[PDB]
Amino acid sequence: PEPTIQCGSEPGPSPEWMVRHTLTPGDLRDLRVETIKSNVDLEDSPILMNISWILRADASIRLLKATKICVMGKSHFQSYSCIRCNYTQAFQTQTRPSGGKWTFSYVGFPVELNTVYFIGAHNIPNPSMAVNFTSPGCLDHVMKYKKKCIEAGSLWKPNITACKRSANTVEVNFTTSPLGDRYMALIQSTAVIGTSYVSEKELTRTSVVVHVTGESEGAVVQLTPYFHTCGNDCIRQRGTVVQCP
Amino acid sequence: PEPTIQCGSEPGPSPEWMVRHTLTPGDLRDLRVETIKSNVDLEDSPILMNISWILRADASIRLLKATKICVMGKSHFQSYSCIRCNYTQAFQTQTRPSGGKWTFSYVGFPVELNTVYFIGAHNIPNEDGPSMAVNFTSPGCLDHVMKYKKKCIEAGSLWKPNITACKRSANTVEVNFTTSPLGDRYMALIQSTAVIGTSYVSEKELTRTSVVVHVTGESEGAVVQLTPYFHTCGNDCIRQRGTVVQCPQTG
Amino acid sequence: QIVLTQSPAIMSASPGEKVTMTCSASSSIYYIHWYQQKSGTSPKRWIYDTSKLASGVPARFSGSGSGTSYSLTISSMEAEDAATYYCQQWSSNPFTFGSGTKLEIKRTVAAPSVFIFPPSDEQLKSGTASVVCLLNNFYPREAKVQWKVDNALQSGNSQESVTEQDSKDSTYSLSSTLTLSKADYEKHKVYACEVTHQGLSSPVTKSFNRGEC
Amino acid sequence: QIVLTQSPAIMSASPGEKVTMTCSASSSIYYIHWYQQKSGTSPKRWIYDTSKLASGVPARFSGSGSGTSYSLTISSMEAEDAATYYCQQWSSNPFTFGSGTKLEIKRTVAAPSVFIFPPSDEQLKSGTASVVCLLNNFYPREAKVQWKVDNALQSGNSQESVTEQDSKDSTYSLSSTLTLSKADYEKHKVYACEVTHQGLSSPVTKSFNRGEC
Amino acid sequence: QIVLTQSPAIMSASPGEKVTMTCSASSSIYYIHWYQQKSGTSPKRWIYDTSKLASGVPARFSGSGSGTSYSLTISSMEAEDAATYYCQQWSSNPFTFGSGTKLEIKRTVAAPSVFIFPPSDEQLKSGTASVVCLLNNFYPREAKVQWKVDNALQSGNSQESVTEQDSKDSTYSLSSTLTLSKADYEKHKVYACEVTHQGLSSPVTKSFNRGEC
Amino acid sequence: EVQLQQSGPELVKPGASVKISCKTSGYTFTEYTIHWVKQNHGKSLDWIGGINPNNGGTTYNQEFKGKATLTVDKSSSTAYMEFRSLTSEDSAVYYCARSYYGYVDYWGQGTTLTAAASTKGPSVFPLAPSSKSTSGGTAALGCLVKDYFPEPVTVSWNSGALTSGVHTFPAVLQSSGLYSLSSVVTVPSSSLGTQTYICNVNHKPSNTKVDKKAEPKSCD
Amino acid sequence: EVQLQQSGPELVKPGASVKISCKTSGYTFTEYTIHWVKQNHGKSLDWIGGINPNNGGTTYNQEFKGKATLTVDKSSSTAYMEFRSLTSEDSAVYYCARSYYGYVDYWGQGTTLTAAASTKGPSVFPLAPSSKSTSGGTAALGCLVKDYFPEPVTVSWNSGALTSGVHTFPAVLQSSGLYSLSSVVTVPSSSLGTQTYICNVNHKPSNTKVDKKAEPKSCD
Amino acid sequence: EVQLQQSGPELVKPGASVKISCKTSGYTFTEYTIHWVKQNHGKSLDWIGGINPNNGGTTYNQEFKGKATLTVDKSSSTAYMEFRSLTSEDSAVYYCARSYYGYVDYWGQGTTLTAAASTKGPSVFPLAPSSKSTSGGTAALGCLVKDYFPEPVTVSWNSGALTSGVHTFPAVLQSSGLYSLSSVVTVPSSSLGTQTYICNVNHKPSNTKVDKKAEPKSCD
Ligand SMILES: *[C@@H]1O[C@H](CO)[C@@H](O[C@@H]2O[C@H](CO)[C@@H](O[C@@H]3O[C@H](CO[C@H]4O[C@H](CO)[C@@H](O)[C@H](O)[C@@H]4O)[C@@H](O)[C@H](O[C@H]4O[C@H](CO)[C@@H](O)[C@H](O)[C@@H]4O)[C@@H]3O)[C@H](O)[C@H]2NC(C)=O)[C@H](O)[C@H]1NC(C)=O
Ligand SMILES: *[C@@H]1O[C@H](CO)[C@@H](O)[C@H](O)[C@H]1NC(C)=O
Ligand SMILES: *[C@@H]1O[C@H](CO)[C@@H](O)[C@H](O)[C@H]1NC(C)=O
Ligand SMILES: *[C@@H]1O[C@H](CO)[C@@H](O)[C@H](O)[C@H]1NC(C)=O
Ligand SMILES: *[C@@H]1O[C@H](CO)[C@@H](O)[C@H](O)[C@H]1NC(C)=O
Ligand SMILES: *[C@@H]1O[C@H](CO)[C@@H](O)[C@H](O)[C@H]1NC(C)=O
Ligand SMILES: *[C@@H]1O[C@H](CO)[C@@H](O)[C@H](O)[C@H]1NC(C)=O
Ligand SMILES: *[C@@H]1O[C@H](CO)[C@@H](O)[C@H](O)[C@H]1NC(C)=O
Ligand SMILES: *[C@@H]1O[C@H](CO)[C@@H](O)[C@H](O)[C@H]1NC(C)=O
Ligand SMILES: *[C@@H]1O[C@H](CO)[C@@H](O)[C@H](O)[C@H]1NC(C)=O
């Protein structure tokens, strides 16, 4: 039979063992990470790492019994956990007879938004393997379905029409969200040239005129929503000012 | 492995053969120490040293009858913890018959948190400095096993404030964090190469709070340090760290 | 004294994929030569003098290397390529071969069809009962077979045998033979073969009751 | 440490001709990478991960190989491909580069136009005489330039300098500078530059008489 | 108390040949460490803990040993390897080094070019005459220089200095300086430097006559 | 055309010696080295040694020195190999081969040498199709070929007419020292009542041939 | 777009220290390792070492370990390489380059370092057009730019107003250690008596600018 | 990255005291032992002692005890070595080095200590190329740098522009107690009379700088 992995949690050593002060050769690509949706049937499924590693085909694989994996997330603060994957049998060939080299993967370590993750792994008996990745934010097509992103407006489709109306005045149309009632419309060319404020408790297509001080033809229009959970840091919507037929 | 060890309480040393050399020769490494939990079932289990050593593969091993081990606290402390491990029989081969080396271990010596330990060992009979020596700092409240000890828990070792800190103005940082049932008083600190800002917070509820820190320097990418003032730890409670970020974080 | 190490020892490739196999010499040689061997015939010279193709050998094959490191490459795998490939040197005495790369055909997963056979009456006259479980035309090769007698797991009384890849559909077949005394066979009623394979979501069990034709 | 031996060290190819150059590693590597460098500028990434083209690279370029043996191929040589190509690995520390393949563009033979320049009077004031002979717009690079002073063959007192291949017509130009003390120069009369080249049926000589006017 | 004995003190190795150097400890040690030093710079950690290579050290290097006996090995000598290698222990106080193995690179024999230089008039005015004989770019290092003054062999009035091996061509250069009083120097006419070297079939002599340019 | 024709197979008691021959034709015998190569069943190729027919000079793989002796006879353009004191580990195919440089360009067809202290023909039992649970589409049936020695047995079906769907498994060495294998075929279940299926088992070492008809067991 | 911008050429007295810089832009500095590479007049590429800007990890070619030191400055997105005791063996072009895996995808423009005590501007001599430098109606004339150190010199003609054939002979190292080059132009021969030709020679290392009128020889 | 930066060279009266420094950076100073190592002109390496910067504890090689004292200053992350009475036997290069376990993984660049009772700058004489030289052929020329103390002198040619073909020989201690060396270069004989060759000699201990033009000897 072929070896598989049985993985479990481990206390593990202090995260200093992960500080590579010599550079490892860059063409050693035996450790890979990618994010996967854990449940595909769900809109907001937990986001997990799929950590894959390749076992080098030489003498030493026959003595291998376990692989250790530790993950450190750095965003607004550090996180640090470790797993040990035990191989269920000893390795009879230095590559798998129905494939190429030996490759195994562990799915776990839920992924947070906007975090840089350091992943290191080492074989037992003996960071030898290392890979990092920075997780995307609420504009990523997969992460936008997270509750934190949706509640900050990641899926709001205001359908902005922003249009040069009269002498230096711009009419901005947009459809509100049920997530909040307060909005700010802004026009910016070489500098911010205009701002206005509308409050709308109704889910409707509202309209507002923003007074601009410079040329308002081809500048960006920026819509700011003020939803509860995101305070002053909700996802903003951008457009461009055009003429009105 | 035919020879075994029976270890006992002989003093018979001097905290001077441990400091025979001010510098101990750096390659005396056949002696290892690792901490082990006395009880698995318990979180606040006592922590012991597992002192293990390998014996030299040479003909003098035939003349070996005991290994002496002394542990010294070094904190203007003296030794007075030595054990003598007698080998039950003579050594017939210079290695085990299917063993890298002759290896033995002794578990004992209760360990304190954040403590520096010098451990020296000497074979009997036989030079007259330590045959083996190792320096050892015991883990602290951040270690994965020691964090569940009672003194660590009560100092906030398991507090998860989930700090979010955002550069608001050129001179202000907004720090959000979740309070602990262990206390009501907190100090938020922003530090780059020096401390650039401090704010104190009083909050009696278990809630997600917010505080503005006025800073005197560049705050982007600086460390945020949260000091809680929990009981039993006074001003020496476990600090929590984060990093200042540019908010909004999206496009 | 030169020894040649070949890697991988066994590998599979789908038609159309690129294939590489290596030959490593314990010290430097002037040339490496490669032979193809299919089950039941003589090896054939395939690539010689490191990079030359014998006449007729498809140009999707190529050889390269120097010093101690050589390789054989197939730009695009074909089913006719499934074979064992040996490298060989005669730059020093003794003439030596490598241990060989067995190249098999990768195909889509196929679950086995399982059959169980009670011992024949002819055999039972002799005192021994062979119970045969057959896993037919499956892929990949890896499969687990467990015997159960009156729902008791057996061990130590069975042997497995696996065919080579079928020439037409590239599948494997497997036999597991459970051998018992007639005495022990006539003591129990339900004989079961439980088969585990990647192509089955749950293990399939096939059984018979003794003497129920 | 890992040595990358590149062959050939120097080569030329006609436009439209197929070009192959090889990179041989002293021990095995996972990938090879190739950089292009033209005179006076930084190397540019050309082929990476053995067979992928850098941004801007025409697909007449391709890379292949594995283990210790790698190659770069140009399906149809273009004049803009003349450059030095370096292979490179970082499968083990240290990161190393190959020794380089200099690729020039071949063309039909073209004879040089030979020109001679006597020393300036301004230079003779300072005490030295540089006599300059020019070979203009020729191919191939190989040429013999022999100085003769009052029909006496010179040796050891001249230096040559050769241009890069012309961007439009791919020829070379060459200067030979004969340097003498003011004393030895004003001591002689006839200074001759003799040029031997494949594009000339007989060797050409250009001369001036010192002290003409 | 432990001391370390290294052998050989000096050796030269052909490019490509296997190199071993040994370190013997006066009593048993737990580890040996090796440092490389090239002329004019600090020693660098090379192999440590007996067999581990520092980052960047070529894998052609290995270390082994135990007890009182250790060695450093180069599987195939490269020119870059020429340097002095020291072993080192700190199993006992004092920390000690071995005396080093100076490893040089062998190349083909090359005879020196010999030059002789008379004393300058500026120096003679001060009362002393230095005559210098130069042996340039030779290999191997061994060479004999004999001074003759009006055919009288000199002794005790000359000093030699030898360069280190050139990094590029692996040759040596040597100066022999014969020093005389102005008084003795102006009594004689023929000052000769006679050179014996493996690359010369017959000894070479270079001479000048005093006060002739 | 170049041809290397080797002598026929030999079944031999352990401890005996044998000499097999390699008859060459189509080229000048003395101009090319002849090699000998051992191949155990299913395993790797081992060079035994080679001989220059011009001068009779030889070189051996030292694992075979003493055990093997190479000779030629120029008059017949024939090479010979003598293997002494055969053990069961010597049962294998043995090839002669021609080289000029370092590679082999022509191979003989192989000579099987089998070491056996005794021979024993097999018992052949039916693997009777589960006619009790017919339909579902395809039924399997077969022959169990038990307790023979040495290898090999040959199994055909219906005197060689039935090849499709036939799987004859590698022999397994039982702990009794004897071999066993099954040969199976899959057929439409509705063919169990209309078609005849006979397995023809041949064991040349013992001159035993066994034909066994495999029938659905009595169901009513 | 990604850019690696290196500091300018430097003359550095042997034994003094120098630190050259590599200013990065167009990407997240902490995401890519920075490498340094040497190219002397021998044109071969020598890797010096690399540094990861995120954590300061480094690895060297041992021929440069102890000789070069690599550092980073995150605020400016800048990498540095420092020689502590520059020697003449160190005169060369130095490149920085960015990697993610084992290959470098963006290169700096290079920094020329000269280890010497002084610079020396050129003497500019005329190569005067004459009948002995004329063929098919075109005359060749030029400027001999001799005895300068270190490289490079630049030559334009008539301050950039001149259209003409141009032949720039690369610098040649003289046995004094000084360089020499010729800059030659081809013009209509009938233009000699009417047009003036000035070669504008620039030697930045010595801050030298020289304009030289090249005049026809009077002997045709 | 870890760096050990040592103070510059020292001239010291025989019998006087001297203190050299070792500036560490790139790591936690108090965590690593600092060692000091001597290298004499015989090139053997002698350990002098080590110091624990955490507590100032020291161990000395007893072959040096009482001659040297090791100290640290934690605030500046610096180690110091003081010789109380430097003698001629003490002139040597001295290294600091950091240890991990029994080996030293980083070395300072070395500090030369010279016990000198006086300084004396050299006389510089021309080594004039010979008139009796081969047609073409190679000529040699040089500079004799005589009677200086202590080492070293530095020699360049043409202000550092001339490095190819240059051999500056190791200094030799004369029986007078003073040093002398030659620096030579080989050039084409046709360059004699066309090129200028100047040797630039510097002796920092005596603040002596001499430039010497070397020309063929004047016939008359
Ligand atoms: C984390 O990332 C790893 C890869 O790094 C993923 O592992 C892959 O998983 C997919 C399916 O999730 C596999 O795709 C399957 O390939 C089978 C063939 O197996 C051979 O060929 C592949 C190369 O293509 C080898 O990797 C493999 O080891 C074998 O050599 C197909 O037959 C599969 O289809 C089968 O399954 C479905 C039901 O699952 C049936 O309906 C089909 O009929 C058929 O039986 C499928 O195409 C892929 O092989 C895996 N690769 C590796 C390297 O393991 C993990 O899935 C991923 N983790 C998560 C949570 O997504
Ligand atoms: C792996 O093995 C280790 C050591 O035997 C053990 O502690 C751990 O529980 C095992 N983990 C799993 C998931 O089997
Ligand atoms: C966008 O707005 C226009 C005008 O208000 C409307 O006609 C159109 O249906 C809207 N489309 C979407 C996708 O919201
Ligand atoms: C914007 O809204 C105003 C007011 O309802 C309407 O008159 C105008 O047509 C709208 N324009 C677009 C582009 O939706
Ligand atoms: C901090 O909390 C306040 C109050 O809930 C909220 O307005 C603000 O957006 C929070 N900041 C962050 C970075 O979450
Ligand atoms: C070990 O031996 C010593 C001396 O023989 C004795 O004092 C001590 O009690 C012994 N200890 C044990 C545990 O046997
Ligand atoms: C332990 O610490 C002492 C004091 O600094 C030191 O001399 C010794 O070398 C250390 N041990 C090891 C193994 O480095
Ligand atoms: C102490 O450590 C050694 C070394 O790993 C180990 O073999 C031994 O079992 C440990 N002692 C215990 C677990 O009681
Ligand atoms: C921390 O709080 C932020 C903001 O409320 C939230 O988005 C995030 O999920 C929290 N993270 C953890 C680990 O609790
Ligand atoms: C992530 O890894 C890449 C590839 O090794 C490296 O270039 C990059 O600097 C790493 N990122 C961080 C933040 O360490």
UniProtKB/TrEMBL annotation, chain A:
Bridged cysteine pairs (disulfide): 7-85, 70-82, 138-149, 163-244, 230-234
Glycosylation sites: 50, 86, 132, 159, 173
Subcellular location per the Swiss-Prot or TrEMBL entry: Cell membrane; Secreted
Quaternary context: Interacts with DAZAP2. Interacts with TRAF3IP2.
Main function: Receptor for the pro-inflammatory cytokines IL17B and IL17E. May play a role in controlling the growth and/or differentiation of hematopoietic cells.
Protein name: Interleukin-17 receptor B
Organism: Bos taurus (Bovine)
